[PDB]
Amino acid sequence: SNSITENTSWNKEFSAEAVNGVFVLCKSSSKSCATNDLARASKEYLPASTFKIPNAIIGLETGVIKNEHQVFKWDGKPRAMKQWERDLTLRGAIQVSAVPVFQQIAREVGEVRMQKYLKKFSYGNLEDQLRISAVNQVEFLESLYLNKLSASKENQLIVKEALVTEAAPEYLVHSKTGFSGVGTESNPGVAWWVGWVEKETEVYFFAFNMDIDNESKLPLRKSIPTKIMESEGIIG
Amino acid sequence: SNSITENTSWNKEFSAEAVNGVFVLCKSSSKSCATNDLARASKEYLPASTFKIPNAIIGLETGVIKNEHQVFKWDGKPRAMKQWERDLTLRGAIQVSAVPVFQQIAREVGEVRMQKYLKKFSYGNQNKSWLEDQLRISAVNQVEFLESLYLNKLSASKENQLIVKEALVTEAAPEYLVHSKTGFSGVGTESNPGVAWWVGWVEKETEVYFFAFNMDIDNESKLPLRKSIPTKIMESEGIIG
């Protein structure tokens, strides 16, 4: 029996940074989610680089991504960022959100196959022609964690390992950042931080998004959720 | 036909701490490895908790470990260590080297199948409930075995190999992922010192580094060196940190 609760206590962390956003934290064992804003938790936004998670699974399931050790070689021709100008593994391409690598994977999969898997994954309603909510992100990440997506357990495991961003004796953090851009002062951009924490035998799924009009605010997409999860005693 | 090259430059890291031990570091594959001591690199020692790597793979292959999300429930009966007195995941059991969890896995596997898997994995010298004490494995054999695991070439499903690889993650950074396992036989005596291990691999962008470290240890206070010496060597190589 799935449930969600509104917790005004986290508004502190948003107010202190003057951030308009939402944090959704779900405890797997109790099938209970908590958020600071139910309305925004259900609102759909451009996924930006969070879309690299389903794109990676689809890339492996279709065969476009050969296997776990697939290397995305750089032809030497300049790219939007120097961090993309080199050979990358799946983990490498995911961490730096390498646009050209995932655009190439998407082209080889094709429009029809890409849409077929996104419907099967219930992923929102091609990265720019799609919108997804924080609640939809945690549901999708839980399906991935449980290997319940329409793809082999092996391909789901490859993507889960490639998303590892923090390891401690008591927990493993799997996560993905997203940033659509600054947008305009009228219609701001969106910044995301989504993932899950395997802490002892408990699993916590999280999705954070915020309005962003200045690239200088990007660090807040990790600091606000990190402070909330630290105060919940989930991570350090 | 793998080769091992002696590198007297790391001797400094050992001598300074007055440590008798070996570090083996292989870039890309176990084909060409570097070490501070050719002789000791190939010398076989008891694996201690490093044995929990093949134990976990065999547990999964035999179905004793049902799947990736297996929980090892605590029966409430006091254990040798407080950190083992709770339910544990495969990663949790591996991280605290939970003896009771792995002893039970070994029993369910059976000494029969266990020995057939170890032979098929080329794990240690091929010459019951004392595997971590009876087995003998070299630092070179550890990096060869970890390279097979990494490449999914052991006689096990890709899925079971991937589950164990994820459970061994100990450090994550934007540029690298460290998979490792500690081992400690005990302090032994000055005449017969125990052995301390740190084995694993680093996925550094497109490159992979396999490592195996072991040292004589006759005093508890020296334990930190099993991680600090290899870390300092890999930090100087620009692999981690």
Numbering used by the authors:
A (entry chain B): 19 to 143, 155 to 265
B (entry chain A): 19 to 145, 152 to 265
What sentences appear in the manuscript?
OXA-10 (PSE-2) is a class D β-lactamase that was originally described in the late 1970s and confers resistance to cefotaxime and ceftriaxone but not to ceftazidime. Natural and laboratory-selected variants of OXA-10 have been identified, many of which differ in the spectrum of β-lactams that they hydrolyze. Class D β-lactamases share the same general structure with conserved motifs, including an active-site serine 67, a carbamylated lysine (K70), and a stabilizing and invariant tryptophan residue (W154) within the Ω-loop. We were able to determine apo structures for both enzymes but not in complex with ceftazidime. Both protein structures contained two chains in the asymmetric unit, corresponding to a dimer, as previously described for OXA-10 (14, 24).
OXA-935 differs from OXA-10 by two amino acid substitutions: G157D, which it shares with OXA-14, and F153S which is novel. OXA-935 differs from OXA-14 in a single amino acid substitution in the protein’s Ω-loop at position 153. The amino acid change F153S introduced high flexibility into the Ω-loop of OXA-935. In contrast, the Ω-loops of both chains in the crystal structure of OXA-935 had open conformations where the hydrogen bond between K70 and the indole group of W154 was absent (16.4 Å) and both of the K70 residues were decarbamylated. This more open confirmation of the Ω-loop created a larger and more positively charged active site cavity, which may allow it to accommodate bulkier and more negatively charged substrates, such as ceftazidime. The F153S variant found within OXA-935 yielded a distinctly different structure of the Ω-loop, in which W154 was considerably more flexible and oriented away from the active site cavity, the carbamylation of K70 was not observed, and the active site groove was more positively charged. The carbamylation of K70 in other class D β-lactamases is favored at a more basic pH, whereas OXA-935 showed decarbamylated K70 even at a pH of 8.3. Thus, unlike OXA-10, OXA-14, and other related β-lactamases, it is likely that the K70 of OXA-935 remains decarbamylated in vitro, despite increases in pH. In contrast, OXA-935 showed higher affinity (Km = 17 μM) and substrate turnover (kcat = 0.24 s−1) for ceftazidime than did OXA-14. Therefore, OXA-935, despite having a more flexible Ω-loop and decarbamylated K70, hydrolyzed ceftazidime more efficiently in vitro than did OXA-14, consistent with the observed ceftazidime resistance phenotype in our P. aeruginosa isolates.
